[PDB]
From a paper:
The capsid was reconstructed by imposing icosahedral symmetry (I4) and using 33,507 particles to an overall resolution of 2.4 Å using the “gold standard” Fourier shell correlation (FSC) 0.143 criterion. The CtenDNAV-II capsid displays T = 3 symmetry, i.e., 180 capsid protein protomers assemble such that the asymmetric unit comprises 3 capsid subunits in 3 quasiequivalent positions termed A, B, and C. For subunit A and B, residues 64 to 371 were modeled, and for subunit C, residues 60 to 365 and 378 tp 384 were modeled. The A and B subunits were close to identical: the C terminus of the A and B subunits form long tails that end on the capsid surface around the 3- and 5-fold axes, respectively. Contrary to the long tail toward the capsid surface, the C terminus of the C subunit is directed toward the capsid interior. The N terminus of the C subunit has a small α-helix on the capsid interior that was not present in the other two subunits. For CtenDNAV-II, the two sheets are formed by strands BIDD’G and C″C’CHEF, respectively, thus containing three additional strands (D’, C,’ and C″) compared to the standard viral jelly-roll fold. In addition, a third antiparallel β-sheet with seven strands is intertwined within the jelly-roll, i.e., strands from the third sheet are formed by extensions of loops CD, EF, and GH of the jelly-roll. The unmodeled density in the subunit interface of CtenDNAV-II has a pyramidal to spherical shape and is surrounded by six arginine residues (R84 and R270) that resemble an octahedral coordination geometry. CtenDNAV-II is placed together with RNA viruses from families Nodaviridae, Alphatetraviridae, Carmotetraviridae, and Birnaviridae (Clade 1), thus corroborating the result from the DALI search as well as the previous HGT theory by Kazlauskas et al..
Residue numbers in the entry:
A (entry chain C3), E (entry chain C3): 60 to 365, 378 to 384
B (entry chain B2), C (entry chain A1), D (entry chain A1), F (entry chain B2): 64 to 371
The structure:
Amino acid sequence: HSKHFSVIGNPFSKATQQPQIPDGRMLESLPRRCQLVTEIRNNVTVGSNPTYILVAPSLGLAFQAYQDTNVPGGLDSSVYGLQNRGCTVRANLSATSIENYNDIAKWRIVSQGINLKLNNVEDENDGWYEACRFQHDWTPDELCLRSTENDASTISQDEDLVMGVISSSFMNGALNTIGNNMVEQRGYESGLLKNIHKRMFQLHNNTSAIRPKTLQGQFNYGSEITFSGTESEARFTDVPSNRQLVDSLWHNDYDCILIKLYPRENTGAAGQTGSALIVNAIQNLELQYSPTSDLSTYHIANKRARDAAGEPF
Amino acid sequence: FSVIGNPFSKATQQPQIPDGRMLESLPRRCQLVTEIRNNVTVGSNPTYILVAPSLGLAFQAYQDTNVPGGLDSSVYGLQNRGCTVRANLSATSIENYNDIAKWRIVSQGINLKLNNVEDENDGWYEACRFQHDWTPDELCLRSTENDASTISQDEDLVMGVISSSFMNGALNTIGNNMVEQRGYESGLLKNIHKRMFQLHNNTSAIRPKTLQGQFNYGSEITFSGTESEARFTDVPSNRQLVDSLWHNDYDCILIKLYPRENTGAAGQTGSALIVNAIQNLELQYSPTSDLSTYHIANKRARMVEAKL
Amino acid sequence: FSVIGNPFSKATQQPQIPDGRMLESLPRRCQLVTEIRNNVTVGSNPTYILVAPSLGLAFQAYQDTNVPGGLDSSVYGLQNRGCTVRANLSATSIENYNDIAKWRIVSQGINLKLNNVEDENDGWYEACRFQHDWTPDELCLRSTENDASTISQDEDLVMGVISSSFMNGALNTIGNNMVEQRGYESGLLKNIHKRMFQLHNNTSAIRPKTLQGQFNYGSEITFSGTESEARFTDVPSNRQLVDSLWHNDYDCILIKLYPRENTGAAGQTGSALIVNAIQNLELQYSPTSDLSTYHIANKRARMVEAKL
Amino acid sequence: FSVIGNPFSKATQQPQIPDGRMLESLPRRCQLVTEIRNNVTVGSNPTYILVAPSLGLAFQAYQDTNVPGGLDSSVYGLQNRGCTVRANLSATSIENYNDIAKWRIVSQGINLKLNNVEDENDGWYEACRFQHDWTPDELCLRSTENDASTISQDEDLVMGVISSSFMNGALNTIGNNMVEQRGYESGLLKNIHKRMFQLHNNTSAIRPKTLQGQFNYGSEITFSGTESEARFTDVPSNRQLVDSLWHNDYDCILIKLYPRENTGAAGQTGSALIVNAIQNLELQYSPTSDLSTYHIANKRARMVEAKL
Amino acid sequence: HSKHFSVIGNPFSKATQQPQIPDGRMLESLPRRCQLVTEIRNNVTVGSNPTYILVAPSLGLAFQAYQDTNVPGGLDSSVYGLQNRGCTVRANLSATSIENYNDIAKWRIVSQGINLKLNNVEDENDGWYEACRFQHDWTPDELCLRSTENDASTISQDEDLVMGVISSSFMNGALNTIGNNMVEQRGYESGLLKNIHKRMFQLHNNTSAIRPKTLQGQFNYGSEITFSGTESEARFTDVPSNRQLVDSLWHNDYDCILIKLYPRENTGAAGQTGSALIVNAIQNLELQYSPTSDLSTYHIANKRARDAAGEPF
Amino acid sequence: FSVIGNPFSKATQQPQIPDGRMLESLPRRCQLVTEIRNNVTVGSNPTYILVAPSLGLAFQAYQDTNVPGGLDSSVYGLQNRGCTVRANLSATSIENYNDIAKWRIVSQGINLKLNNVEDENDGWYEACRFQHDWTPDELCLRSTENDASTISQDEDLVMGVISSSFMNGALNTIGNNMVEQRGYESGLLKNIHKRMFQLHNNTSAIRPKTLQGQFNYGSEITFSGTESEARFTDVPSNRQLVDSLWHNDYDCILIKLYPRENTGAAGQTGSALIVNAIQNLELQYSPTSDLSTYHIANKRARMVEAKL
């Protein structure tokens, strides 16, 4: 069980391609390492206002970034989801349901984290950051469904989806409040971007008894889920069905990480095009699949074994 | 504790799960024995038995001679042992009249014996366990009477699957992919008697389910106008009901039967099976709510005798 | 083992008698807590609390404010714990509807606490245990309802003494000669809260009493026209009924009380006692005789489905 | 671990549950001390003290002199310790303005002391603990103000039982059958000062309840036009609110009181009880949602000073 | 490479769960063992006419049976396909194409075979059989698309499909001709059904250089594919598009096996309900997946290693 | 205990000073992070940062871009963490609204990081600690808002130095004799990031300072008519105030900066510094004095319900 402990806590760890939590709460589950690499750069429209990166325990979501250069259409944040990897739900608009097309019965997170590296030339390598972890009490009308495609079109039939926060949360909602009061948050850290590659930001569990969330094959929705006519976004009201859906897609046994960025401004002028971070998100999952699924046959017995934002990457 | 035991143990069985998740709990042994037989309607097509972690359901049998009216499966309930809910139609609710506050399963299983003469002992079977991502519209309320009439006042109910799951739903899909499932086995019916089929828990931290004293419902539960069944849509109220009567900390078992055909004639009357089903429960009871039989006397003394 | 234990003791309370005389027995704890007070008609005369090894009886109290209609004693029973018989008048029999096949007592007794204010806390008592040679004409049947109506169909019954025993019968005679009796004690009522009175067995080999499902009677049991009491003559049948409801392997307890007078006025309202009777039973049950609320399906599979 | 400890014990009082189920939690001790008395309208009927695992509620008392307007029970809350939710009527939501993300109870209970003079110190009580299978229509929201006005904006709320439960509902039914319940005790009120009543957990794996920052409601919560109470129907939303304010991993305590009568006159003014409720909580907090009194300066240095 | 040789030829072989042909023609492919168990019983309507079992090298098809008790609706044969196993195509009727939803780029058959066991009581255990292998020159109008569901409904959106032969081929087409002239076929064998469990019928390759077939993501079709209004069947005309589709789904580097059955008649009378065979088909495949696929990440390097119908099962 | 520790310890830090001089004290961690930049007005002359043992002052920075109106320095307060006093102008007093009875400092320090691109990373610095014989007319009250307007009602205040001390007062004299002071160091700004500057206590017996609930003042405190500052004369009242908010059991730190010049043009915008200041306090709190939010209920029971 040594390799499992190496991966547990430390997502950036090539110890085993089969990471599981050995607590006996998921007998014969299936590991899944999902990795994503991308570039985060603050866009021109945010100006000198701070930007953000949110790492949340949502299923299939690597992270969410506010006012970077990949924001689609009229939305102010980008979702970086892990698609075509067997750990996403999709939009069965014809049946008006959220379809569990991979047939995941139960799921939890073995570990999750990001590492960021500044790649600007040394004459443009300024900017700083703060980071914290927190255990916010989410309401569904603060959350939303985003197409993993992160594109500028309405959510269409069979579109892959992940749960994110509404973009305005960064501007005037919960995440703005946390970002304005970072120093009082747990695990507070601050530093320069030129050094941020030394850090590994991993999610932490708020309990030692992490129970998997459950999912139905189809989750039928009424008018409480409003699909945008323009954006790739669907919004919730705070009603029982949306609370059930949030429970099934947002694992509340883990805390979130928020990184607030004061980057070099992006204006368009010659040497003034922002701060570019190479990002390396990883989400290590434990799944139980339903027999109808393709990935059912790869199940493997899992038998019981006997507070700072960043760590030294 | 890792895995739940075998209810048909000649050895000694633990009355409860010794983990400290249900303090001062009481064990309830529920057992049903009955003969079942594949009916004539199903002809030469296979039949099915489903054992589910559903409170008070001994098993559900697809297309046996007991099927009521137009429904295509039978349910066998343990309502005589005090572990079912009933239908309170006047108050339009599911009533928890046995005062169960919390329940889980210590062990549950089934054992079948072929009761056929020597020259009619053909047939065979496949069996497996599975963890399925149930949607509520795949489940339903069935009367434990398993009779041909509508659900009426104070009818005992169990949660089972809509009969169509067996023919073109989830159970058919599993029924056709048995040999790839976990815990697969196959054999001849004349040998099935030496097989104890037991449910497996999918977690070692089994938390009890909670029941309300009354579970109220609106139009999302449709009671059938002729049959002893009520259907669910997939809405928040019905998910909560499914969460109270179906224990998703346990997998299900599907037995697929290829029985000797029953044409309703001598020599060809199907494969009679003696079924022994046990559901060992662990219960925490709420206070008795119906004292209609009790003699409740005023505990304060009278100042003076009623004589004066 | 030699002697039974204290039901109120908080020290390793045995649920059975470890003598091997009742194999696969079950325990049953039956407790009643209530307040009582001497009434006005008894005046400055003594009152009594009898604790007897009668099946289902917590205690009998002479001349308290609860005495029904024209009877002079109150019976307090444990009918709500399913340890009684009832009147089957339409069959003219005493019905053992709780299906008790055999019974004995594991422990029994009462604890009394004075519930008067400090300037009204006078009074004293004498207490003893004894082994009277009861005759069935000294005993009677009483409705546990303890009401001023006649015994009706299915009314719960306990065997107690006739009320006139306390006044001019065996209990009065014993009450007048308490120091000669075993276990004699006396004290002030304001200190009685410290006494855990408990029945004693007069043999270390306590054999269970037996009960029939029905005990038919003739004219030897006279039901009062107006009172909730039935009387006995001394004939073989009544002796046989006495033997099944009164365990004579145990001694009785008589508590004679000399309380503050109840005249009905302010400051002269008697002595209120909070009584805490307990009767712990060891039972061998007989199979459920009433299955009117069971579902009993035919255990043989139909040959063909009903819709054919 | 197995069972929670005694909040009144002066012996190594754990501030947390050492089970690892709430990492970086914080403790919160909430204590209320007050006097109560039975009122005149209840007369010679019993009164009740309920202690429940509801968030922020010290205890609920049936028919004491503090009952607000036309309600028959008083709620006593710990709002001053920041462990409550409040009414956000202008958003039609229940506001978790104290930013509690998750909570469980470490220990809870009450101690009662009789505060009558020695010539008025009569009365007695029965006490038990139980694990009722609550339905949301038996519960309600109550303003901790405990006043005779309607629930206003930002009014602090605790979840308690509807007052009619004590009279003709589940609590009355439990109150009539106390000896059947676990932990049964009885005694005189003049001795109740010796009892440290304490809640019990019904599982050794107590998982924290969760709270949202806002809990929006529709018509399923009816606010009284005249009283400081809001009522529930049994619908999915109310069940979800019940689950966040009522920790059902714990049992409730019912104390049934038979006190000296309050007729309003001299020497007949009831039984005064000094109540010492404590609720010890383990909390995981969520980041401060209200920074209206914070100073938030821009963290980026200006390029130039303002006076230029 | 010993386990690979054990599985190659011998499909019923628990030597390795990763069987591949080590000829170097599929570098870094992915094995797939697909297994099916069912019952074949001659139905009442075929009377005393012979029945058939066809084992063909079609993708995702275990075998096809003529006039058994599972024939759906008005069709005279049953398809037993391997569904929910990552090796099937489906019917994108909305886009009017045959969709390669698992994104298989290249595929071939490592081995394929069946074993049959009679399960009638000894007083009803008569009947005999003949078997042969052959290398028929197929025309597309002899083939067709069948829903793997083998049900009595029209092919609907996203229905799983396999290639089979048209049912009438057994009655008056190529398979009737082969069945009538079995003795002249290669590998001819004949026997009693009570002994047929001793035999293992495996497909054989007609070349030592087996080249994988290729598949597109979408295969668009015109009116040359006619979907039944009633049955779960789509028929071909002999046109270029249908020849391309047949090439992509029917591997012509292997021969077919045909078993002709003379069973105990099924009439309905008491002891006269046919011959019941427990069937254990296995198809061991070698696939190359396209990167978009879920099963892409499980690719494994495959480096070069250096005539009778039945064998002793 | 000899010397106070380093607030930026990767190791584990003592929450309090373990000497027994503040029993039942509570620790308060106060931290401020912000970017500062030398302004244009100061031109090529050096700038300064002062860290003082002043309650709630994170640091004071001479001539940075945040200077308000006509004042020549900025203050950075920790008023969000509850360790400052405020201005009660209606009662003409300094109000101790956080109810601090006694306070000292466990550890206090600062860490600066140069946030400048590679071709603008010039500059250097000298630093030292000093014990100065402060006179009150060298100190002043500053608004923590650090804004361009007069001090108004309930304004949070910290004690800092008059800005002129930096240019021609005590701090300039020290600023020019840095290399003779205790704990001198110098370096390049591009290297200052690896330097933890911490205050040193000048005694090992650190006694807490006391604050009044209200500190009244007369004309000896002059509030500025345009700026957010109040000046002191040297009179007995002002010495007592300086003794309550400035802890002379600790030395100060002066960092003298020779930054890259800021002309307000691209390429020449000064030396941006990320400042991390921590003041770890040890506090003894007085009882809460503002209960405007509390619900204070009468603890005495009503004789009769308000209903009658």
